[PDB]
Every structure is written in C-alpha cells, then in structure tokens.
C-alpha cells in the first residue's frame, strides 16, 4: 500500500491521498478519494473545508470548482465510502474524516517555461489543485501556516494496441525471413507470424468501431487476413518441403497484402502537381505504419516518388510538427516543429524512388522552443482525444501532431503532404510517504 501526505507550517491539518495522477477514462474520471486529519484544539470553534480548483493561469482564470466540508458529517453526501478511505480512517485515530471529489472533463497539459511566450501571461498552464483550509466562515482571512494545497494531474492514457503489436511481430518475422540462412529460422519465423495473424484476425480496427459485427466492412477485413494466412501457409509448406529460397520467394508475396491493408486502414496522403513546360504529373505519396505512437518510440514514414517531368528532385525533408490551439475566448492558434530529417536523396527525371524514414520526437533538442506544449522529467504533451459532442470553445489546450514530407525541386512553392498521428502514453499495512 502507498499513500501520500502533506502537513502544514502551523501543523493544524493533514491531507492524505491514494494517488498522484488521476486517469481519465473518457466516459468518466477516477474520483479523488482523499482523507483529512485535523486537530480540534486550535480549531475549537472554527471548521475545515477541502477545495478543488481547475484553473488556467497576473492573468488567471478558473474552469471548475467544488467544495466539501469535513465535519459535521451530518449531511453525509456520497455516504458509500470507498475501501481505501475506510481503511485509512480505521487505521488512524478517530479524528480523521473522509471526503470525495468527482470532476467533469477538461484539459490537463501545460506550456513551456520560456520568457515571452505566445499567449497572454507568463509561465502559463492548466493545473488541478486540492486544497484544505481552516476558518469559521468562507470569506475571512487565510493563514498560510494553517492551510494546505496539493497538485494533481489528469493524465489520459492510450488505448490498446494489440493489432499494432501483431503487425509489428509480422513485419519483424518477415524481415528475419528475408535475412535468413537455413530452414530452421524460416520455420520459426513463419510459425510466429502465423500465430500473430490468427490473433490479429479476431481484433477490430479502430475505423469500424461504430460498424456492426456483421457489417460488410468487417467481412472484407476478415477476408484480407484469411488470404494472408493462406499465403503464410503456402510459404510454410514450401519451407517444410526443404526449399529455402523458394520459401522466401513465396514469402515475398505478403508485401502485396500489407500494401492493401495500408491503403485501406492506415494514415495516407497523396498530392499531384504538373508544371508548365511539362507533359506528365509529379506524384508523391506517403504513409505512416501506425496511428498511435508512444513517447520515445520511433516514427517511420514511407515515401514514394514517381516523377514524370523534366525537372529533378534535390532533397526530401521529413518533419514532425505540433499543433496547439488554445481553446479560450481568444482562440489563439500556433505550431512548432519538433523533429526533422534532411536526407539528400535525388530523383531522376522519369524515375522512381522509395525509402522509409524513421525519426523520434523528444524534448532533449527542444529545450529552447518558445511555446512548445509540455505534459506537466516532463515530455511533449500527449495528443488530445477528440470531444464527444462537447463545446470546443471552452476546452482549454488541444494539442495534435502532424507529419510533413516535402520535396525540393531545382530550377524554381514545393510539394508536401500531411499525415496526422497520435502521440500518447501507455496504460500501465500502509506507510505514509511524502507527496
């Protein structure tokens, strides 16, 4: 068991909690199951309250607030006490009393700490704050020594990625098939990917959640994996026969169904420009391999160029950009790049090019950015999940991420595409420890 605690400079109260950061389950947010211990000797006449404030901050505004009174517990609202509350009260003396908070959704992130930001105020951010204080009436003077205030965070975790894990296994095993030497490694890789494919066929893609189990989209989705398992079966048969090279040749056919899955279910973009003094268009197509990426995990960008003009492509630029619009009444909007690649690849006239570019966005190189969105060991702000019909005007800070692939052409705007993606965090007796 692990609980936290903060005392006061005058030592007239203490606040206990079971957690630091409270997860957000989209539909509901975990409650704040606090505990308060008070010494009635000084507070012989007065009372004690506990307050929660969700504010944006000298320019300062609030977004949500709620108050609860410890005693007398005669109007015992939320009378069902959670287990930890009862155990904490019973373990400690008879002067500990319970309280509970429940909150509607809001936005949890902060902004970077640099002089002269891009918004109103300095050292801004949105933070939650548990606070208890002692008095007789709710307007009197506040004695900081006889008070307390804590900070809690509304972290929000990424959904399950079983399908992504299955596809990652499939791709790694296909690679080790391609680099194999003898029959045993080929057999082991094929067995692993067969298991992964069968597992993946059960799961449902994020783009058909509202579609029914018997919808034709689901039928086509399952048909694709049926074909994939058949191709793996053919490759396994050839490998078990004894032919290693033929097994590899049969395994190469999986790239076609991988491409078919990408074009239908993965982020993709395509543009086309045909200049004057030219006859056929220039085509650029990119695609990311996953829709969800974790903080620090590399981000891989496919790129395809089929030039048909008389000009030549000089270099390709791959970048990851942060879009952070401030959902206040001022509706300020801005963006800042995070990661960047500057490969010097060239595309000849009437030629084709293809490569995979992998870049990792993280804060070490971005310490000097002026308005980059931070979490709250801090890292870049996780992408905000979309509103479920809620008003966007009072959300707060909505952060999202996009990826850009731009070509540069000699004898001279350029050509580029966007690929939105999601950057988030993965879902993971008693002694008091300092919070």
């Amino acid at each position, epitope marked *: 068991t692990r609980v936290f605690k903060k005392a006061s400079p005058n030592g007239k109260l203490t606040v206990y909690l079971g957690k630091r950061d409270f997860v957000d389950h989209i539909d509901l947010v975990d409650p704040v199951d606090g505990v308060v211990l008070v010494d009635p000797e000084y507070l012989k006449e007065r009372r004690v309250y506990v307050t929660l404030t969700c504010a944006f901050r000298t320019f300062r505004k609030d977004l949500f607030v709620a108050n609860v009174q410890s005693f007398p517990p005669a109007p015992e609202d939320k009378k069902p006490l959670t287990r930890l509350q009862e155990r904490l009260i019973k373990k400690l003396g008879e002067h500990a009393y319970p309280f509970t908070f429940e909150i509607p959704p809001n936005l949890p992130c902060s902004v970077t700490l640099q002089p002269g930001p891009e918004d109103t105020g300095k050292a801004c951010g949105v933070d939650y704050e548990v606070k208890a204080f002692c008095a007789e009436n709710l307007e009197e003077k506040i004695h900081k020594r006889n008070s307390v205030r804590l900070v809690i965070r509304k972290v929000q975790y990424a959904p399950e990625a079983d399908l992504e894990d299955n596809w990652e296994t499939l791709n790694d095993n296909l690679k080790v098939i391609e680099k194999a030497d003898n029959a045993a490694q080929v057999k082991d890789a094929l*067995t*692993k990917m*067969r*298991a*992964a494919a*069968l*597992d993946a066929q*059960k799961a449902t893609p994020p783009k058909l959640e509202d579609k029914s189990p018997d919808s034709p989209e689901m039928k086509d989705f399952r048909h694709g994996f*049926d074909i994939l*398992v*058949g191709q793996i*079966d053919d490759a*396994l*048969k050839l490998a*078990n*026969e004894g032919k290693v090279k033929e097994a590899q040749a049969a395994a190469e056919q999986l790239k076609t169904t991988r491409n078919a899955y990408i074009q239908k279910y993965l982020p993709t973009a395509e543009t086309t420009r045909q200049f004057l003094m030219s006859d056929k268009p220039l085509h650029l197509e990119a695609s990311l391999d996953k829709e969800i990426y974790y903080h620090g995990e590399p981000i891989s960008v496919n790129v395809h160029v089929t030039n048909n003009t008389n000009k030549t492509v000089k270099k390709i630029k791959i970048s990851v950009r942060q879009y952070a619009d401030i959902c206040l009444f001022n509706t300020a909007q801005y963006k800042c790049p995070v990661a960047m690649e500057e490969a010097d690849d060239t595309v000849a006239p009437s030629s084709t090019f293809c490569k995979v570019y992998t870049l990792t966005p993280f804060l070490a190189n971005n310490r000097e950015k002026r308005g980059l969105a931070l979490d709250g060991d801090t890292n870049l702000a996780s992408s905000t999940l979309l509103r479920e019909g809620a008003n966007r005007e009072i959300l707060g800070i909505i952060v999202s991420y996009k990826v850009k692939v731009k070509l540069v052409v000699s004898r001279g705007s350029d050509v580029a595409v966007e690929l939105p993606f999601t950057l988030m965090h993965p879902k993971p007796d008693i002694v008091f420890e300092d919070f």
Partner: antibody, heavy 124, light 108 residues
Framework: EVQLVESGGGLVQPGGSLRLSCAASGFNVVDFSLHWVRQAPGKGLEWVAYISSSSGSTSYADSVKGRFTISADTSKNTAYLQMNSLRAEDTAVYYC?????????????????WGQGTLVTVSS | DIQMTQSPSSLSASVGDRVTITCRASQSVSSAVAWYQQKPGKAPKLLIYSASSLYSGVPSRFSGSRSGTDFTLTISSLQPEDFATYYCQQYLYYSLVTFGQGTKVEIK
C-alpha cells in the same frame, strides 16, 4: 454416417515392416486431411504424420521422420501409413483423425472425428 | 517444437462439485487449443474447440477460458459419467501438433 475405420495391427519383429490403412466412410478423403495419433500403453498422445491428398504434402514426427511413409488414394478413400524397421519403442495403439482445411470453421473443429484404434506390438 | 504442460497431474473430487484443469503453452497460440476426454478403453472425444466453443452434442456443463497462454477447462457440476482423462492440444499448423500429459479425475 461419418466414421473412421482402420486395420493392419499385428505383432512384428524389430526391423520388420507393416502396413496400416485408414479407411473413411461417409465423407470423401480429398476434402479433409488425415493424421496419425499414437498412444503408448500408460502414456499420453503423440502425433505421427499426416497427408493432405489435395497437394500431396506430407510431414512426419521427429521420431519416425526417416522410417515411415504416408500416401493415399482417391478412388478407394483410404490412407496408408507404411511402417519401416521398428525399434520396439513404438509398440502402441494407433488412431486416425480428421482435420478440415483452412478457410472457415472446418479448420477450427480440429480432430472432430477419430477412429477406434489398432494395436501394433514389437517384441522378440 | 512448442511444448504444452498441464499443471494438475491427478485431481480428486466427488459428484456435483466444481473442478478446473489448467494448461499452459510455451509459445503464443491464438486460441488454437482444444480439450479432449478419454474414458479408459475408448477413443478421445473433442469437447471445446477454439478454447471457448462447445462442440455439438457435448453437454453444457463444460466451459473453457483463455488468458494469454493460460487455458482452463471447468466442469461446474461433474457427474459419474465425467470421470476420465483429459488432454490439451494445440493446432496452430499441421506439423506442429503437440499434446499435454494426462489429468485423471477420481472419486474422493
């Protein structure tokens, strides 16, 4: 109805040879894959070999990889498992099983219909 | 090859009680596990295919659950005709078929 029948069980000297058949009635063999499962007296099940009869594909257990040979015919609806020199550690009952092909439900109903079993014993 | 182990070698219970048999696989098999029942002197009989689906004809007191590489078969209220040896099996592909060791149920 659907049923599996096998024959050929007998006593053979070590280094001897014996033929086992898996006759199927009520269903054509070419629509299913047939396997051989061996159970020692007092021990668990063990898988021996199989054939497909649609592409001719065969495979064998690592214990009888080089010795046994499996083949089938369509007109007679029978699967034959030739036994070469026997090492006296294979004195066990022998069951025949049926497993359907991949696309759909028949693959998931693995070994839904078995046989009754035959006894092959090796001694001196 | 993929090895599959059964934890309880022998289990004892009376009629009407609850009994559970567990089975673990060394390598991931995506619900490609089946349970069989073998009375002394007869052929094996399939009970649960795909680790959760009850085959036709089998009574409804059987049920199987999968959690990762852990498969459990339960008989809610076993009867005198439920005493036999049960076996685990994986069927990911044709050439990779392995069976677990027996579990025996007796009368306490």
């Amino acid at each position: 109805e659907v049923q599996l029948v096998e024959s050929g069980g007998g006593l053979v000297q070590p280094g001897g040879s014996l033929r086992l058949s898996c006759a199927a009635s009520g269903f054509n063999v070419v629509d299913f894959s047939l396997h051989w499962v061996r159970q020692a007296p007092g021990k668990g099940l063990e898988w021996v070999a199989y054939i497909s009869s649609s592409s001719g594909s065969t495979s064998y257990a690592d214990s009888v990889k080089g010795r046994f040979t499996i083949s089938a015919d369509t007109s007679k609806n029978t699967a034959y498992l030739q036994m070469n020199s026997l090492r006296a550690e294979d004195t066990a009952v022998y069951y025949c099983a049926r497993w359907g092909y991949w696309p759909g439900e028949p693959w998931w109903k693995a070994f839904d219909y078995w046989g009754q079993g035959t006894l092959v014993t090796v001694s001196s | 090859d993929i090895q599959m182990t059964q934890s309880p070698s022998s289990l004892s219970a009376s009629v009407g009680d609850r009994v559970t048999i567990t089975c673990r696989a060394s390598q991931s098999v995506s619900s490609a596990v089946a349970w069989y029942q073998q009375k002394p002197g007869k052929a094996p009989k399939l009970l649960i295919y795909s680790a959760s689906s009850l085959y036709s004809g089998v009574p409804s007191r059987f049920s199987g659950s999968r959690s990762g590489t852990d498969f459990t078969l339960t008989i809610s209220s076993l009867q005198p005709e439920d005493f036999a040896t049960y076996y685990c099996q994986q069927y990911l592909y044709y050439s990779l078929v392995t069976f677990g060791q027996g579990t025996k149920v007796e009368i306490k």
